[PDB]
Amino acid sequence: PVKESSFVEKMKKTGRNIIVFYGSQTGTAEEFANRLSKDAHRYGMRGMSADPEEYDLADLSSLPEIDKSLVVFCMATYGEGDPTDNAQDFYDWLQETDVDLTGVKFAVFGLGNKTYEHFNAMGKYVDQRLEQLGAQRIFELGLGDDDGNLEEDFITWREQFWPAVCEFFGVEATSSIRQYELVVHEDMDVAKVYTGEMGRLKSYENQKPPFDAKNPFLAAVTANRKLNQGTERHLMHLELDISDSKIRYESGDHVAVYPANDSALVNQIGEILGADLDVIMSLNNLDEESNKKHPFPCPTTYRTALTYYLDITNPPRTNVLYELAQYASEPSEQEHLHKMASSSGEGKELYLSWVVEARRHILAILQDYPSLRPPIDHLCELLPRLQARYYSIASSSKVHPNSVHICAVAVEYEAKSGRVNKGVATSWLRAKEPGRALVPMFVRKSQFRLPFKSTTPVIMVGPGTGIAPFMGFIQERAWLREQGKEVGETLLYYGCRRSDEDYLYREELARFHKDGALTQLNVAFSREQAHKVYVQHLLKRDREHLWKLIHEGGAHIYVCGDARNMAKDVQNTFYDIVAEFGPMEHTQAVDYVKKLMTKGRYSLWS
Numbered sequence: 001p002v003k004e005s006s007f008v009e010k011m012k013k014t015g016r017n018i019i020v021f022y023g024s025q026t027g028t029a030e031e032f033a034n035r036l037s038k039d040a041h042r043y044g045m046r047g048m049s050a051d052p053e054e055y056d057l058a059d060l061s062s063l064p065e066i067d068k069s070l071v072v073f074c075m076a077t078y079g080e081g082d083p084t085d086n087a088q089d090f091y092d093w094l095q096e097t098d099v100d101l102t103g104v105k106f107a108v109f110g111l112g113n114k115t116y117e118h119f120n121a122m123g124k125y126v127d128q129r130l131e132q133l134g135a136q137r138i139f140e141l142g143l144g145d146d147d148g149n150l151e152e153d154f155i156t157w158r159e160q161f162w163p164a165v166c167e168f169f170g171v172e173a174t175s176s177i178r179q180y181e182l183v184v185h186e187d188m189d190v191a192k193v194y195t196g197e198m199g200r201l202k203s204y205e206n207q208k209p210p211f212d213a214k215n216p217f218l219a220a221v222t223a224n225r226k227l228n229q230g231t232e233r234h235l236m237h238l239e240l241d242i243s244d245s246k247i248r249y250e251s252g253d254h255v256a257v258y259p260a261n262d263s264a265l266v267n268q269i270g271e272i273l274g275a276d277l278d279v280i281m282s283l284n285n286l287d288e289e290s291n292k293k294h295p296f297p298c299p300t301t302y303r304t305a306l307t308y309y310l311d312i313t314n315p316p317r318t319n320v321l322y323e324l325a326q327y328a329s330e331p332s333e334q335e336h337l338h339k340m341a342s343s344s345g346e347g348k349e350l351y352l353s354w355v356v357e358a359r360r361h362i363l364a365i366l367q368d369y370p371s372l373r374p375p376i377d378h379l380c381e382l383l384p385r386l387q388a389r390y391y392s393i394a395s396s397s398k399v400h401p402n403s404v405h406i407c408a409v410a411v412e413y414e415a416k417s418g419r420v421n422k423g424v425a426t427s428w429l430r431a432k433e434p435g436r437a438l439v440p441m442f443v444r445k446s447q448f449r450l451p452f453k454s455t456t457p458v459i460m461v462g463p464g465t466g467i468a469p470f471m472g473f474i475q476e477r478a479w480l481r482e483q484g485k486e487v488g489e490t491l492l493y494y495g496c497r498r499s500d501e502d503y504l505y506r507e508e509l510a511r512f513h514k515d516g517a518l519t520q521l522n523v524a525f526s527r528e529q530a531h532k533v534y535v536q537h538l539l540k541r542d543r544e545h546l547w548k549l550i551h552e553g554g555a556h557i558y559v560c561g562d563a564r565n566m567a568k569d570v571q572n573t574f575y576d577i578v579a580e581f582g583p584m585e586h587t588q589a590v591d592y593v594k595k596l597m598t599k600g601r602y603s604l605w606s
């Protein structure tokens, strides 16, 4: 993991006074950072954005060597209040270092979600440490909330941020600037055009270890069957073959996949923009110094970039609608698009209802504002990167060392846009039929693990697809037994709507219970009666016995599935169990369950 040379030197050579660092798992903090960097130019300053994993942040002590210098951290919080994977080296440095940051000016925008226990843990930490190390905060810590609207929190913070920067440094605010230039390739050889590979040219057709985010392994789809019994939704079990990939995983780990966008959606964007999507091109950085040569692997076709490199499905952010406004020939449509970027009033409210709440993707916006006819080259520079999708691996490597199993609900909903929207990755996984049907993937290691000693009892709470990793856990616990190992009680609390609708792994779980692999199979059918039966109803019922396992057997409790509501209700039930059988007050119950649910006991998403 070889760091770039000093970022202070880079910015000294390039004539930049502001650097903006992104802690980003799924690219939102990265987008915020590039926007702040560009923003610099409109205030007589020069900005760059940087991936902190690539630099040694100790070079912060050198940043005062540059006049009227400033560092901004856009820091997403991931996991159970941990840093993003790219921010982990920064985090571990901040803890260990006692460097003197005297004369360093800083500001932090945290990206977080209130529904999560540790709201912007990473934002707040970074903000606090730089101070403790002797750096001067030039503007208040921003607490962005994805639970509300994060975009609107960024608008509000940025709008106040720049005036204060201008005020402090004694500089003054002063027109569409493009980051990249279009180059069309007429006479290009087929063998040097990217076709959806993420890393090296021909990484896909030409597979060579080691496999990771930058070089995903193309795993063959062994299996892909309907799990759910009814037709109400589509829940799907997939087995990916990682034979000869040299990939190592444990139960509780995550599998990331790189999907393709819907063909019809891509062609429609092309048709409505009157564009030739089969043109071969590059968008090359106009700043010849930046290592970011292109916004995505180039040269390549618009069709390819729209299929594998670009997000064409999520509600576009305000700066993308703002940049497009110029290409709207009807003054009213130009006005709406321009005002999407307001921090207040009618424009903000239109952006929240018409774009966000209605889940309008770029194509819908082009259709509903027919006067908006951008050129495909700028659109492709503006759209964000298509991100990998993570899934809890539904198999144990002890049992299935050459296969990675996925348990997923297909996303397909009716939006206020009047359109039916489709999950990019789930629609694409669904269409994979068992040359071979190939899925670019890699493994991200998690802290979500079985207890070290087999005698330790496990309690697993995993309604709906929340069961994904517990299938692995149960496979593995079953395996230890049949290897003559001594295994504690193994308790599954699972949930679904009906026995005959969405009872995932019904046959497989019946089996495990008969063999003794599951000590108890407790299932809550939330719609087999007038009232809701949920997992925390079964938890409260088993309160006496669950306390025995927790207090006397040091049982590990695992909780996977919906972050918003399920995980909070489950935790309140555990607080209520501890408070009875301690005894102790509610305050000490909460301390107790917090200490029990240490990093690697919650696997939550929403």
Ligand SMILES: Cc1cc2nc3c(=O)[nH]c(=O)nc-3n(C[C@H](O)[C@H](O)[C@H](O)COP(=O)(O)OP(=O)(O)OC[C@H]3O[C@@H](n4cnc5c(N)ncnc54)[C@H](O)[C@@H]3O)c2cc1C
Binding pocket: 254, 313, 359, 389, 390, 391, 392, 407, 408, 409, 410, 411, 412, 413, 414, 422, 423, 424, 425, 426, 427, 465, 468, 604, 605, 606
């Ligand atoms: C660590 C982790 C583990 C995960 N494990 C699993 C797993 O085991 N199984 C699983 O199925 N998924 C899992 N997910 C979710 C997964 O990553 C994907 O987000 C999910 O499969 C949908 O991706 P997609 O590309 O199909 O949808 P996308 O195209 O990315 O769309 C997702 C968005 O659709 C919108 N949406 C969905 N339904 C509606 C609705 N009714 N109304 C309005 N908007 C709606 C929401 O805005 C949501 O953010 C996990 C996620 C993480 C981060």
Ligand SMILES: NC(=O)c1ccc[n+]([C@@H]2O[C@H](COP(=O)([O-])OP(=O)(O)OC[C@H]3O[C@@H](n4cnc5c(N)ncnc54)[C@H](OP(=O)(O)O)[C@@H]3O)[C@@H](O)[C@H]2O)c1
Binding pocket: 409, 463, 464, 465, 466, 495, 496, 497, 502, 524, 525, 526, 527, 532, 534, 535, 536, 561, 562, 565, 566, 569, 605, 606
């Ligand atoms: N607007 C949106 O963005 C939106 C809307 C829908 C789904 N989603 C997402 O899509 C996924 C749905 O997948 P899934 O099949 O795993 O979920 P699911 O089937 O809807 O949930 C599984 C089970 O959990 C139960 N449950 C619901 N609320 C609960 C609570 N507070 N406590 C305990 N149990 C509860 C459900 O009962 P009941 O359903 O009968 O209550 C059901 O039996 C989730 O990740 C969800 O966040 C998003």
Ligand SMILES: Cc1cc2nc3c(=O)[nH]c(=O)nc-3n(C[C@H](O)[C@H](O)[C@H](O)COP(=O)(O)O)c2cc1C
Binding pocket: 023, 024, 025, 026, 027, 028, 029, 030, 076, 077, 078, 079, 080, 081, 082, 084, 111, 112, 113, 114, 116, 117, 118, 119, 120, 121, 146, 150, 604, 605, 606
């Ligand atoms: C698996 C997962 C875990 C998360 N954990 C936290 C958390 O512990 N605290 C928090 O405030 N936000 C949490 N979030 C919310 C994210 O910080 C938020 O979505 C943010 O915008 C992600 O930014 P990024 O795209 O740059 O990664 C989590 C999101 C996911 C998907």
